[PDB]
Design a binder for this molecule. Structure first.
Ligand SMILES: [Zn+2]
Ligand SMILES: [Zn+2]
Length: 102
């Protein structure tokens, strides 16, 4: 199919500026508000496989948000690494930077 782009608009919020949870379509650039609403609504989340910015400890529903992350969120360079270590929660791939970690 050539594809008819239409149904994507407002379906995908992507990630704009902040921490978008994997489990919710709400986002906040405030880590406190992020972890607050997380602890409140999704304190223990376990599922299958996803990416989290280890740096920010934020799980998102798309690997993309981690990719644009060092682009806009942790700007300076673009070099993210992947490591799967997520304890208490599920085992999900945490994506850390080798530089923008500071
Ligand atoms: Zn959330
Ligand atoms: Zn981050």
């Amino acid at each position: 199919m050539a594809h008819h782009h239409h149904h994507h608009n407002q379906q995908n919020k992507k990630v704009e500026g902040g921490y978008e949870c994997k489990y919710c379509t709400f986002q906040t650039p405030d880590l406190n508000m992020f972890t607050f609403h997380v602890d409140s609504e999704h304190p223990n989340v376990v599922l299958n496989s996803s990416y989290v910015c280890v740096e920010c400890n934020f799980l998102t529903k798309r690997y993309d948000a981690l990719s644009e992350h060092n682009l806009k969120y942790h700007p300076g360079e673009e070099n993210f690494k992947l490591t799967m270590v997520k304890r208490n929660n599920q085992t999900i791939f945490e994506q850390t930077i080798n530089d923008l970690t500071f």
